[PDB]
Scaffold this motif. Structure first.
Motif, PDB file in Angstrom:
ATOM      1  N   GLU A   1      -6.579   0.568   4.676  1.00  0.00           N
ATOM      2  CA  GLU A   1      -7.993   1.797   4.280  1.00  0.00           C
ATOM      3  C   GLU A   1      -7.707   2.553   3.176  1.00  0.00           C
ATOM      4  N   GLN A   2      -6.336   3.028   2.552  1.00  0.00           N
ATOM      5  CA  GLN A   2      -6.232   3.699   1.184  1.00  0.00           C
ATOM      6  C   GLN A   2      -6.849   3.043   0.292  1.00  0.00           C
TER       7      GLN A   2
ATOM      8  N   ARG B   1     -11.964   0.708  14.298  1.00  0.00           N
ATOM      9  CA  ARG B   1     -11.772   1.233  13.165  1.00  0.00           C
ATOM     10  C   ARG B   1     -13.101   0.236  12.697  1.00  0.00           C
TER      11      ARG B   1
ATOM     12  N   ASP C   1      -3.638   2.750   8.047  1.00  0.00           N
ATOM     13  CA  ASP C   1      -3.757   4.050   7.011  1.00  0.00           C
ATOM     14  C   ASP C   1      -3.403   3.251   5.598  1.00  0.00           C
TER      15      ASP C   1
ATOM     16  N   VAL D   1       0.442   1.459  13.274  1.00  0.00           N
ATOM     17  CA  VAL D   1      -0.548   2.744  12.892  1.00  0.00           C
ATOM     18  C   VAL D   1      -0.312   3.053  11.168  1.00  0.00           C
ATOM     19  N   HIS D   2       0.474   2.028  11.109  1.00  0.00           N
ATOM     20  CA  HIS D   2       0.802   2.585   9.008  1.00  0.00           C
ATOM     21  C   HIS D   2      -0.058   1.536   8.533  1.00  0.00           C
TER      22      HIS D   2
END
Ligand SMILES: *[C@@H]1O[C@H](CO)[C@@H](O[C@@H]2O[C@H](CO)[C@@H](O[C@H]3O[C@H](CO)[C@@H](O)[C@H](O[C@H]4O[C@H](CO)[C@@H](O)[C@H](O)[C@@H]4O[C@H]4O[C@H](CO)[C@@H](O)[C@H](O)[C@@H]4O[C@H]4O[C@H](CO)[C@@H](O)[C@H](O)[C@@H]4O)[C@@H]3O)[C@H](O)[C@H]2NC(C)=O)[C@H](O)[C@H]1NC(C)=O
Ligand SMILES: *[C@@H]1O[C@H](CO)[C@@H](O[C@@H]2O[C@H](CO)[C@@H](O[C@H]3O[C@H](CO)[C@@H](O)[C@H](O[C@H]4O[C@H](CO)[C@@H](O)[C@H](O)[C@@H]4O[C@H]4O[C@H](CO)[C@@H](O)[C@H](O)[C@@H]4O[C@H]4O[C@H](CO)[C@@H](O)[C@H](O)[C@@H]4O)[C@@H]3O)[C@H](O)[C@H]2NC(C)=O)[C@H](O)[C@H]1NC(C)=O
Lengths: 383, 383
Positions: free
Chosen positions: A113-114, A159, A110, A106-107
């Motif tokens: 994508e960050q 994604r 993100d 999960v991390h």
């Protein structure tokens, strides 16, 4: 997009004397289909991806400056791990705990994508054989790593992100570390780390990346051709296999009176180069300077089984030149593999100032073979 | 000042992660009488001093940033050599050739003045016994090294520059390597490397720097007290002798079921620390974290012959704490020696964050004894 050219960009190449300094602005995106940003690291406590150099990667925006190259049609992934980050049990603690893997996945999405990353390249060295100490890790590292890959695969597919891994070229480590069929199916490519077969740790001179068996060999599995066929025979999809090419040499200091041949006993790594500053290691351009300016002698194998090595006094360095880089790329094409991988952009003669062969001669040679880029012929170091 | 506090600053501490990063700005010059910049290297081809890290030392001016601290009334010298530069014959080729020594001396004066250094610290490990391999070097290394020192002394005295050397604590090596009376007379101080008496190479647990003979000893010369008296008996001026203190521990992985005692069989060095990342080695601050946060148990010698060691699972590390650092400085005063040496600044708890005993507790303790600097009491690790 038939063949990939997977380029490793190393963030620590900025911390180099000016002639060796490599920044995101030095990347030529025309010479890569995929760029891997090496390296992010695993937080020991949280077991999630974190930047290894906040000041460069984030404060000075190096992450974003490299992912911005996707406007040139290259895919840009974040590389996690590497040799130095693979010390200890933290990766084993991650993959052997179901809840930790879930938090990681999960991390990771993100985090990537960050900063605009297209995916993640796993460089754990290695499952079970932590820093090649196979007695150290649990047998369950193989299955835990495979499960991490499967779970990353499912989350990344939602994604549209890419998932790859850099993997060992040691038969021993491969047997301990990898569920080869599962990895082949779940990874977009497998980057074989087909180098560092030999180095000063052997206590005798040897080639960093032998291509075929040599008569002086004591182990007939320490060569690229065996490694590739072994992965295939273990169940790997040939199109998933990407063959790494080292853009650097392994250097040695040879025992007095032992000669300059292969297998000569050694007592240390070679003297450090001015730019790379690491005994046992020389960039391709540092080797060019030694041959071109310092009179080092180039020794070749008429059988074409290993690349050259260069010598001066008791110094000895083995490396791939233009001709062996070309051959390995042509091997990839003849074997119908997935492509070639470059370790690493900054160790090529990327400025063109050291070898007199144009900018980035090794990487240009690989692009010529695999992607049809018109190019000059391979340059002869000795000339 | 009657007593010296000779501080080793190691430049490639700059590359350590997080709180292990140590920069010239972390040096507290009030805690040193002399600072040694470790290390420059000997160019193999020219046999002259050269920077080992052009990017840090020269481009980013770390040489000058450290020598600028002399405004605090400290002397700043450049250290040449160290263990890693001492493999092979290059130092032997220098000292055994009269014309090479002359070229070295002339170049060394200009190199040092260029960057503002007050002098030179020789750290060849070792004359004759290259990396303690006494069969490698010629007997004449002893006389060549003494002649080099004599010739440096002559040239440095024209410039008011200082000359020192770090020297072996091994009786065997001392007998092979050093013209003790000549070195004592020609050096401003002699830094005894009174540490690394024991380590994972022994294949059993032992203390990094025993102070006095211990009943478990197999060799009664492997302790600081013998080394110091041996140099005196060999003809050294006591004033010239500077007793080194390690700011780190030697770590071991102990055989299962062998216990936690001294002399317990071991199978590897200890697991590497998070910040120093070197198997068999732990900084004092890494040891503090283990005792304070990870529950490692401290074992002391009620007889005061060796410093403490700490244990957890099969891990085992011996080290000097505040109390033994204090004792070794008080020994320096009772013996009326030249001072104490710190190996090295960056391995102390220089941030104060790991041991909770203030900044640089080991170095502060030494300055307290030798220079009367007010200080907090020694901190008991176990508290
Ligand atoms: C990378 O790693 C791979 C895996 O470890 C290595 O794979 C091995 O590669 C060899 C190929 O050289 C292969 O060996 C056999 O392949 C087939 C079996 O299916 C055989 O036909 C081959 O026999 C030929 O070669 C033999 C030489 O040892 C010879 O004894 C035999 O009679 C036959 O000779 C012909 O071919 C020779 C080479 O062209 C000629 O010199 C000879 O005169 C014969 O030529 C005539 O016949 C040919 C047709 O057979 C014809 O083409 C020609 O024009 C003429 O008419 C061979 O034994 C291994 O099985 C294979 N192993 C695996 C697991 O795949 C690979 O070698 C390695 N690469 C490198 C570069 O090291
Ligand atoms: C570091 O390495 C060195 C290697 O070179 C070691 O050097 C050795 O150091 C020892 C001392 O540890 C030294 O020993 C002799 O020193 C002189 C000889 O010139 C003597 O005074 C000493 O004799 C006393 O101690 C003897 C040992 O027990 C004892 O048998 C003798 O009768 C005498 O006893 C008195 O002193 C003791 C200590 O205070 C008392 O326990 C005892 O009751 C006696 O005390 C009485 O008399 C005192 C006056 O003498 C008085 O002060 C006191 O108040 C009371 O009234 C001793 O034998 C070695 O010569 C030396 N060796 C060399 C080669 O140089 C060094 O030990 C080492 N350090 C460590 C910590 O290991």
């Amino acid at each position: 997009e038939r063949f990939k050219v997977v380029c490793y960009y190393t963030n620590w190449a900025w911390y180099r004397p000016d002639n060796g300094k490599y920044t995101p602005g030095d990347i030529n995106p025309e010479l890569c289909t995929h760029i891997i940003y090496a390296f992010a690291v695993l937080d020991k406590e949280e077991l999630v991806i974190k930047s290894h150099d906040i000041w460069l990667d984030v404060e000075n925006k190096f992450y974003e400056k490299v992912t911005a190259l996707k406007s040139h049609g290259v895919k840009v992934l974040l590389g996690l791990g590497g040799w130095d980050d693979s010390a200890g049990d933290k990766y084993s603690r991650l993959v052997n705990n179901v809840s930790a893997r879930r938090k990681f996945v999960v991390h990771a999405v993100d985090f990537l994508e960050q900063y605009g990353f297209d995916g993640l390249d796993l460089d754990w060295e290695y499952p079970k054989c932590w820093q090649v100490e196979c007695e150290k890790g649990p047998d369950s590292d193989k299955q835990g790593f495979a499960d991490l890959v499967k779970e990353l695969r499912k989350a990344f597919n939602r994604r549209g992100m890419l998932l790859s891994a850099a993997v060992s070229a040691s038969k021993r480590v491969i047997d301990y570390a990898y569920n080869v069929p599962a990895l082949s199916m779940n990874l977009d490519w497998i980057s074989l780390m087909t180098y560092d077969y030999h180095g000063q740790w052997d206590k005798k001179t040897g080639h960093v990346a032998p291509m075929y068996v040599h008569d002086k060999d004591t182990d007939n599995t320490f060569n690229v051709n065996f490694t590739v066929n072994y992965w295939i025979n273990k169940g790997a999809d040939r199109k998933k296999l990407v063959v790494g090419v080292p853009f650097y040499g392994q250097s040695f200091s040879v025992v007095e009176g032992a000669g300059t041949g292969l297998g000569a006993p050694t007592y240390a790594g070679g003297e450090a180069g001015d730019e790379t500053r690491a005994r046992g290691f020389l960039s391709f351009y540092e080797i060019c300077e030694r041959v071109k300016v310092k009179g080092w002698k180039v020794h070749r194998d008429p059988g074409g089984r290993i690349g050259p090595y260069a010598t001066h006094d008791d110094q000895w360095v083995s490396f791939d030149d233009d001709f062996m880089a070309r051959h390995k790329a042509e091997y990839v094409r003849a074997m119908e593999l997935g492509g070639s991988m470059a370790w690493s952009l900054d160790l090529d003669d990327f400025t063109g100032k050291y070898c007199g062969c144009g900018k980035a001669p090794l990487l240009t040679t690989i692009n010529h073979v695999l992607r049809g880029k018109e190019a000059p012929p391979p340059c002869i170091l000795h000339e």
